[PDB]
Amino acid sequence: NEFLDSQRVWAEYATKRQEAIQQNRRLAFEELEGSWDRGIPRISTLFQRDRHTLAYDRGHRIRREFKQYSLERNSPFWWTNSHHDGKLWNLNAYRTDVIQALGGIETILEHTLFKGTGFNSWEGLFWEKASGFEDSMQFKKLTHAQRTGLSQIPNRRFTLWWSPTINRANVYVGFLVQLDLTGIFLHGKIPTL
């Protein structure tokens, strides 16, 4: 579909260009909406702002391929190079759809501790990320154990968030031990939680 569609939309683009020429115009990238995130390379290429520089980036695919010998951490996308090709996939739709599948945001939240945070709506919030947190406290004279603990930490948040559905009958079966002084029953030594 992508290759046939590429064939199509490039022809279309060419036609458009010809038309523009006939009517003396630079080709309006406003018109190419519809056939924008299609084609290989994408029509998003042609009107990227670094077009004329990337003209000289040649033997680029092969260079990318040969990164398996230069940079160590190894590349799950050696094949395409965003610049010269474009977003060769989209998965934005996917994120949207997954939420829907799990009864929308609200439903998802109702799994999580969220309502415990006691906000009216969710519009105004933000998370502090885990990687960021790790980074922040990895500028200190920390003995390896400490570092490990820090690394672990970004779970001791995730777990808590998902607590109220990692800590019920159906998820884990067994005891129901009372966390001391509190009406909070575990369903297992989910130690972080």
């Binding site: 799950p76 994120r95 939420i99 990687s131 998820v171």
Partner: protein, 96 residues
Amino acid sequence: SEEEIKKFDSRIRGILMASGSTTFTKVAAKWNTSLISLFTYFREAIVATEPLLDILVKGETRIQNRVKLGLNSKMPTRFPPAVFYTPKELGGLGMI
């Protein structure tokens, strides 16, 4: 190709190992990237190849289990999918 499938499997396994320290989220992200790589690049080919499909099934399961293990020594009956598939931004892991 068999070889590519094998490579994919290895990648999954790699992700799974070196997890002890590594966060659930990071691991999940890695998995996503690997799976995205697999899919975006072959696309058509996966739906035919049954072995690859099987691997994907199992790989995903393994990934889920790592998280489960982290959460509790005892394996659960089952989580909801929620924790795994909910997006990073709603506090999930964002497995694709």
